[PDB]
Design a protein around this ligand. Structure first.
Ligand code: SF4
Ligand code: SF4
Ligand code: SF4
Ligand code: SF4
Ligand code: FES
Ligand SMILES: [Mg+2]
Ligand SMILES: [Zn+2]
Lengths: 125, 208, 690, 117, 77, 96, 48, 115, 86
């Protein structure tokens, strides 16, 4: 009732993806960086998978942005790094993993602004 | 609350909680979790092996008799080891109530067909197979129902591109319609709309 | 230990003493609303948006400034804190202008998002709003002060980070305004960051004005190549066009900031670009040709000559892939004359030991040093983020700074030991009091710039600095893995080229003039046709038409750093890779692909075919080039110091003068910067001001 | 209220109302609007490209209800059939010409309907 | 508001096409009945939920108030 | 203010015109090129500057709810005039 | 419009035009933006 | 461990048995498909196409993937036999209108940036 | 036949590179005096066996493993490479 087969998962032959969109692609597994224009951090909570950028050219009519790859807008969301790595592996995609960047904790002291002898004393407020 | 806020119904909430406890007690072999939402919707999470028993009990029991299968579909969550969750929506005319049953599967594990419990499931399981690639065992005739003949892939998967891989046109040299790789005159514009400054504190996750 | 127990919404958490309420809530996973608080700046406490309720306390506290007390329960979502947030948002929006459709920061506004999430949905303000006149602070930052909420983030950043005290508040009450009080331009190498720190549209990028909306842009995470710091950046693109450059947070390199050149030099990527292969016609002029014809013309000359007659020069913006490709191609010709425009002394160890030409202390290590000595360098313009780190350490760790060279403005006070190079010999001998000052230092640091190595005394200057470092090690003992010796690099391609075995400097070309010369992005003007024999064949490969292009026989259009996935190694020795944001224009191709195609045309086909195989070759040559965040490395100071005692070249009596002496010399350094109109505007503004 | 062919309006002084906020482009359910902008010679915030693909448009009118300055409207013309696909790809010149052509009726309809909006 | 209107539900007896035709005609008549009731009982008041974080504000409010303009911008972007 | 390119084509208010060697001019052969004859920049340049004796004034584009969002313009600076960021109208204090 | 005429504007067309499809005055679409990337122009003087 | 629920085949031998049955059915069907759809190809080239489509998946070592492929191929055969497909669907296997993409490095370098 | 450069790849903390570390620290300076014009590139590996590369004329390259070699073993390897004898 159970096969108990030892082999890594591979579903490339079942997904219907063309041959040249499997071996030549390079997905990036990363936590997106915070938009430095804003202080919110709610967009740096999950892991993202994105594909490598391909050619975009100008349409001779309308000058619009034309593309020839179907994976230019495909972005996946994952809870953990391991989930993204497993999904990339079982789909036969070569991947690059970037470790999550966390802002290190810092020491803040409002009283350090009005310092008696240190350089941290502010000239205005 | 105020007239812009949807009112609550505690009586229906209690009734659904009691019936969820009842069903969970009767079938401890398959039931994994029971939930009741704030808008009075009852969900029962079961093991995949219990699809036929749980559905048969809900259809045939005197106190349940959910005689109508409202809808059957799948949801794709790539981050889970079991990629797909199967959702059954049932309606009981005798007691004027609705129930939801959820299970799970992956790309390679078949799910038992429920066409013997509900005849309506025949086309729903075909649609699930066509859109997600979930195989249903002992189906009368499982085949594509929505996509074109010879279409490769399952479009409703999250990793399937929106515009697909091939496009159609008429070729005069061969005097027939041919398929060629997609090439957009204007690429679909991806919009990053999700904002920081999290909106709903009640759903905040532990920072692990 | 000394941790105290505090509660956030009833859940316990252990925090260090001195932790504020905001940080205690952050440790739980909630971001407290804020407008004036910045993690990188001093606490202000004026926007009052972070007011939160402490249980069993009638009055709310400012989470950004109030240190949490043991046993406190922070009610982050109680009715009191929500009402405080709504009132503060109402007060902030009472006078704000209805400028959202015309404000450049529509979809990136902290004010808009925090009004949606924490404020009300309507206004009861029936009066007229205030309007203040705009200010002119240069061609980089557009100023619309009606949108200003008076959070004083810009003032604090200018005072503490940029070292410029030109910003402040004039007036009182409702009529208090942020500005300079006079017509004065806020020009510094870090002036563009006040746009990022500003939560509203009061400060916006002027060259970026009105061009794009944030939800439309695609975000590409890449690496800056404008200098050798290698600050992490985000490239915003839309419809295949680069729109702007944003900093990407990296605590160890650039924290949250980028230099003005890094931020605004992308304008030069749209001008003076090389898009097609070019050759010389019968009239001696450059004309367009196909890739096949140009590659065949180069391959014929490559096959005609071999050995010492073939040479290559690498520019300041060349990646490791193209460098190793060119090295392999010329090695198949039995040519070892592979040179860079930047000069490093080859005497003794040379490039054999990696620590001989690296910033061994690393950028983050500056925060641990107590004394730093700068020799023959201007860190403010050569490495703006390194100088910013030094300024931060000087401000917070009471770091002592001394300089040997021209008395340049570094935005912090330092000790000017002098200008003559003989001061290095005096310090090494032990007569100078700064030798004893270095002796007492627990974490001494000595930094020598490559600009000081560009002069003929590079070997002697390096030997003197190594003697100083060796005296420090011998006297003060072995503190540990501190790595006193340091060298600050200025160009992004130098360290990778030195790791790959390139010969620093161009002395080999002058000693042995070639008949075929490769200019891989070389626009320094070190070698001209006067230094070459008659009818020398020059191939220029690059992305910009500059000083290196018109004297070439064949022009091969390459890709810029924004148009390829390329490896760069910073002055720390840390290898980083860029990503493709847009594709090269016209017929331009990837540099290593051009070299590999040329090798195939000449019959000397190279083993690699894809980018992965190129990086495998890089690992074969220098394995540290594939460790994409590693900075750790072995210290071989003793061996290099001992090998530096062989030659005894004398120092010249010429004052140390860095190439960048004022801000006007900082904007125009490379081909991308020289083709930028924004840099030209900055140079014009600093040269004559309005 | 009826939605017809799209038009770009202008102020009574003669300057175009559009300020290139790109809200209509963001709200467009069919992605039928393409907008490019830069500062004008006088420093005004104006578009250099404003394209509407009428063979992608669904004529929902979301763009005109999202516009904060009443710049883009969907005018009452419905008899604008075309013999080729290309002439249904409107650029900024075509939309400004449509506005100048239909402004009288467009303004009358807006006056009739603006108290319901 | 379907609990506030009165109508009858046509019920078939044979399960064939004729019964379904009769049922549809009767539903048309009952729809006329419900339309009459709706016309005679139309109440006053606003048309969308008075919550600007979900429903966009009025044009005059959007062109007059700061909060209304912010909410309109965010709801339409 | 429609100008004519040296090729002969009308230059639109966005300033674009196909170059001499551009093959894309072939689309206008046997046909015409749509150019809007009313240039907004010139038309707003013809508007006279309004004289107001107030330090801060508001502009909504006219027509009340039929204009643009109401904004307030400061007129403290005498070197230049206050310009509406929505409508382009100019305002100025009565100097001297 | 005879009893109450439309509001007069300087930019409103004085002469109404009908549908001009299939006619030399038909609308011909084109890009209204300028060139984005500027090419380098080689010098006219020979190097040697 | 790694115990999984079977679809049709417990091991590889019976999976290959199903593969061979499907191949036999397709090989038998090729001439009837060629005649009935009035295709311009020959029976030899149709059987060559069938062989190539079977050989594209020769690397699979998972019996579950193998029997899912067999199920998909049997659906394909059912579509072909019942004349649910038209001539275009059958001819889509040959890519007659697609210009060939050269494989060598120089051709890809000349044509564009696509590796 | 002419040797062009030598590359020594040793891992910083692995015990397989202990002999190479000792060799460098003790006698790399003397080896460099013996060959002042020969570039000897010392780089660091990671979770890889120590290796030595020699580049010859026209791009010919050969590599030898130095795993678990003592300082004397890698020394003798370097004299073997420099003198040209196998
Ligand atoms: S700063 Fe923010 S709230 Fe103010 S006008 Fe600009 S986008 Fe709107
Ligand atoms: S200009 Fe911006 S950063 Fe400076 S005080 Fe005003 S709102 Fe704050
Ligand atoms: S009417 Fe709707 S579909 Fe058409 S352009 Fe406007 S928003 Fe887009
Ligand atoms: S038409 Fe209106 S909504 Fe669209 S960009 Fe112009 S001003 Fe904004
Ligand atoms: S964030 Fe605390 S008062 Fe401003
Ligand atoms: Mg800002
Ligand atoms: Zn106005």
């Amino acid at each position: 009732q159970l096969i108990a087969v030892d082999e890594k998962l591979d579903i490339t032959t079942l997904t219907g993806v063309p041959e040249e969109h499997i071996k030549t692609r390079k997905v990036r597994i990363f936590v997106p960086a915070r938009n430095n224009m804003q202080s919110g951090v709610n967009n740096t909570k999950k892991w993202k998978m994105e594909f490598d950028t391909r050619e975009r050219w100008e349409n001779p009519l309308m000058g619009w942005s034309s593309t020839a790859d179907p994976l230019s807008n495909l972005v996946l969301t994952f809870s953990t790094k391991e989930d993204a790595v497993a999904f990339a592996e079982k789909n036969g995609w070569s991947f690059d993993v970037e470790e999550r960047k966390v802002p290190k904790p810092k020491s803040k002291s409002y009283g350090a602004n009005f310092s008696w002898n240190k350089r941290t004393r502010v000239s205005t407020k | 609350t105020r007239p812009t806020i949807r009112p609550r119904n505690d009586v229906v909430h209690k009734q659904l909680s009691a019936f969820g406890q009842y069903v969970a007690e009767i079938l401890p072999k398959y039931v994994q979790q029971v939930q009741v939402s704030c808008f009075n919707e009852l969900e029962i999470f079961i093991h995949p092996d219990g699809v036929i028993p749980v559905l048969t009990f809900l259809r045939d029991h005197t106190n349940a008799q959910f005689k109508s299968l409202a809808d059957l579909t799948a949801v794709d969550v790539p981050t889970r080891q079991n990629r797909f969750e199967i959702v059954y929506n049932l309606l009981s005319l005798r007691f004027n109530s609705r129930i939801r049953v959820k299970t799970y599967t992956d790309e390679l594990t078949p799910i038992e067909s429920s066409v013997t419990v509900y005849k309506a499931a025949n086309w729903y399981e075909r649609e699930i197979w066509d859109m997600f690639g979930v195989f249903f065992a002992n189906h009368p005739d499982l085949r594509r129902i929505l996509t074109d003949y010879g279409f490769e892939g399952h479009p409703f998967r999250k990793d399937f591109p929106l515009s697909g891989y091939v496009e159609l046109r008429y070729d005069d040299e061969v005097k027939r319609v041919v398929a060629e790789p997609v090439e957009l005159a204007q690429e679909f514009r991806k919009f990053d709309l999700n904002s920081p400054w999290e909106a709903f504190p009640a759903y905040r996750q532990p920072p692990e | 230990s000394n941790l105290i127990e505090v509660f956030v919404d009833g859940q316990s958490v252990m925090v260090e003493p001195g932790t504020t309420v905001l940080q205690a809530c952050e440790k739980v996973g909630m971001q407290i609303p804020r407008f004036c608080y910045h993690e990188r700046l001093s606490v202000a406490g004026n926007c009052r948006m972070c007011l939160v309720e402490i249980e069993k306390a009638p009055k709310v506290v400012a989470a950004c400034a109030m240190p949490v007390m043991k046993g406190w329960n922070i009610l982050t979502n109680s009715e009191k804190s929500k009402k405080a947030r709504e009132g503060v948002m109402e007060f902030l929006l009472a006078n704000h202008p209805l400028d959202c459709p015309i404000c450049d920061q529509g979809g990136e506004c902290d004010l808009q998002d925090q009004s949606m999430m924490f404020g009300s949905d309507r206004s009861r303000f029936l009066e007229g709003k205030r309007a203040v006149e705009d200010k002119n602070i240069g061609p980089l930052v557009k100023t619309i002060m009606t949108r200003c909420i008076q959070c004083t983030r810009c003032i604090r950043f200018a005072s503490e980070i940029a070292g410029v005290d030109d910003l402040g508040t004039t007036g009182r009450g409702n009529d208090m305004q942020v500005g300079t009080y006079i017509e004065k331009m806020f020009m510094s190498e870090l002036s563009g960051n006040i746009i990022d720190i500003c939560p509203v549209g009061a400060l916006t990028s002027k060259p970026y004005a009105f061009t794009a909306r944030p939800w439309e842009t695609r975000k590409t995470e890449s690496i800056d190549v404008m200098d050798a710091v290698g600050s992490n950046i985000v490239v915003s693109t839309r419809t295949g066009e680069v729109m702007r450059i944003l900093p990407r947070m990296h605590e160890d390199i650039n924290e949250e900031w980028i230099s003005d050149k890094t931020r605004f030099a992308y304008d030069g990527l749209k001008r003076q670009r090389l898009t097609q292969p070019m050759i010389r016609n019968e009239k001696g002029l450059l004309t367009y040709t196909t890739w096949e014809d140009a590659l065949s013309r180069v391959a014929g000359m490559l096959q005609s000559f071999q050995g010492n007659d073939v040479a290559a020069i690498a520019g300041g913006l060349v990646d490791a892939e193209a460098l190793v490709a060119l090295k392999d191609l010329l090695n198949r010709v039995d040519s070892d004359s592979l040179c860079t425009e930047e000069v490093f002394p080859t005497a003794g160890a040379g490039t054999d030991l990696r620590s001989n030409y690296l910033l061994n202390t690393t950028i983050a290590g500056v925060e641990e040093a107590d004394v730093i000595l700068l020799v023959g360098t201007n860190p403010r313009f050569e490495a703006p983020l390194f100088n910013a780190r030094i300024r931060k350490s000087w401000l917070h760790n009471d770091l002592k700074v001394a300089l040997i060279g021209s008395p340049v403005d570094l935005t912090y006070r330092y000790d000017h030991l002098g200008d003559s190079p003989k001061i290095l010999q005096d310090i090494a001998s032990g007569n100078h009091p700064f030798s004893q000052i270095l002796k007492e230092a627990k974490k001494p640091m000595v930094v020598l710039g490559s600009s000081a190595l560009q002069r003929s005394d590079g070997t002697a200057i390096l030997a003197a600095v190594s003697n100083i470092a060796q005296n420090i090690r011998l006297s003060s003992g072995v503190t540990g893995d501190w790595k006193v010796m340091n060298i600050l690099h200025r160009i992004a391609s130098q360290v990778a080229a030195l790791d790959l075995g390139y010969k620093p400097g161009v002395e080999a070309i002058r000693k042995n003039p070639p008949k075929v010369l490769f200019l891989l992005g070389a626009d320094g003007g070190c070698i001209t046709r006067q230094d070459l024999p008659k009818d020398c064949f020059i191939i220029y490969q690059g992305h910009h038409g500059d000083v290196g292009a018109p004297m070439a026989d064949v022009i091969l259009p390459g890709a810029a750093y924004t148009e390829k996935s390329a490896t760069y190694v910073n002055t720390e020795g840390r290898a980083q890779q860029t990503k493709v944001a847009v594709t090269p224009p016209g017929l331009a191709r990837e540099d290593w692909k051009i070299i590999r195609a040329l090798s195939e045309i000449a019959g000397m086909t190279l083993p690699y075919d894809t980018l992965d195989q190129v990086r495998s070759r890089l690992e074969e040559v220098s394995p540290n080039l594939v460790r994409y965040d590693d900075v750790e490395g072995a210290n071989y100071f003793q061996q290099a110091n001992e090998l530096s005692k062989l030659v005894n070249q004398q120092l010249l009596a010429d004052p140390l003068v860095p190439p960048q002496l004022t801000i006007k010399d900082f904007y125009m350094t490379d081909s991308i910067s020289r083709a930028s109109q924004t840099m030209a505007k900055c140079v014009k503004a600093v040269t004559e001001g309005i | 209220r009826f939605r017809g062919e799209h038009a770009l309006r202008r102020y009574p002084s003669g300057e175009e109302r559009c300020i290139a906020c790109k809200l209509c482009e963001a709200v467009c359910p069919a992605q039928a609007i393409t907008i490019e902008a830069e500062p004008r010679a006088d420093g005004s915030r104006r578009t250099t490209r404003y394209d509407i693909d009428m063979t992608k448009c669904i004529y929902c009118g979301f763009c005109q209800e999202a516009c904060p300055v009443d710049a883009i409207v969907e005018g009452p013309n419905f008899e604008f059939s075309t013999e080729t696909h290309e002439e249904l790809l409107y650029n900024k010149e075509k939309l400004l010409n449509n506005g100048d052509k239909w402004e009288a009726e467009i303004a009358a309809n807006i006056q009739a309907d603006y108290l319901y909006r | 508001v379907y609990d506030q209107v009165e109508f009858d539900v046509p019920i078939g007896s044979r399960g064939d096409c004729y019964d379904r035709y009769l049922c549809r005609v009767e539903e048309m008549r009952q729809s006329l009945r419900i339309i009459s009731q709706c016309l005679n009982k139309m109440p006053p008041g606003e048309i969308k939920v008075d919550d600007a974080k979900v429903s966009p504000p009025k044009r005059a409010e959007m062109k007059t108030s700061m909060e209304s303009l912010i909410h309109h911008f965010k709801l339409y972007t | 203010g429609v100008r004519t390119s040296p090729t002969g084509e009308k230059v639109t208010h966005t300033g674009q015109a196909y170059d001499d060697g551009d093959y894309r001019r072939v689309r206008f052969s046997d046909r015409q090129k749509e150019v809007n004859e009313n240039f907004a920049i010139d038309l707003i340049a013809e508007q006279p500057v309004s004289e107001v004796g107030s330090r801060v004034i508001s502009c909504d584009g006219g027509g009340g709810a039929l204009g643009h969002p109401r904004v307030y313009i400061n007129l403290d600076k005498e070197t230049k005039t206050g310009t509406c960021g929505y409508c382009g109208l100019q305002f100025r204090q009565p100097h001297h | 419009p005879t009893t109450k005429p439309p509001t007069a504007r300087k930019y409103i067309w004085t002469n109404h035009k009908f549908n001009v499809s299939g006619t030399p005055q038909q609308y011909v679409p084109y890009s209204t933006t300028r060139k984005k990337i500027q090419e380098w122009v080689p010098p006219s003087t020979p190097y040697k | 461990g790694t115990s999984v629920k079977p679809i049709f085949s417990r091991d590889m031998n019976e999976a290959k048995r199903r593969v061979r049955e499907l191949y036999r059915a397709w090989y038998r069907e090729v001439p009837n498909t060629v005649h009935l759809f009035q295709l311009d190809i020959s029976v030899k080239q149709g059987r060559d196409k069938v062989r190539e489509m079977f050989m594209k998946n020769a690397h699979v070592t998972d019996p579950r993937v193998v029997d899912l492929l067999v199920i998909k191929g049997k659906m394909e055969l059912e579509e072909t036999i019942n004349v649910w497909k038209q001539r275009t669907h059958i001819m889509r296997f040959f890519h007659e209108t697609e210009a060939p993409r050269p494989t060598d490095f120089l051709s890809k370098f000349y044509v564009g940036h696509d590796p | 036949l002419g040797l062009r450069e030598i590359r020594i790849h040793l891992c910083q903390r692995s015990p397989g590179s202990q002999g190479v570390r000792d060799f460098i620290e003790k006698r790399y300076v003397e080896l460099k005096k013996a060959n002042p014009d020969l570039p000897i590139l010392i780089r660091e590996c990671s979770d890889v066996q120590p290796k030595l590369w020699a580049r010859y004329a026209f791009g010919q390259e050969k590599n030898v493993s130095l795993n678990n070699f003592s300082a004397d073993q890698v020394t003798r390897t370097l004299e073997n490479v420099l003198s040209g004898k196998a």
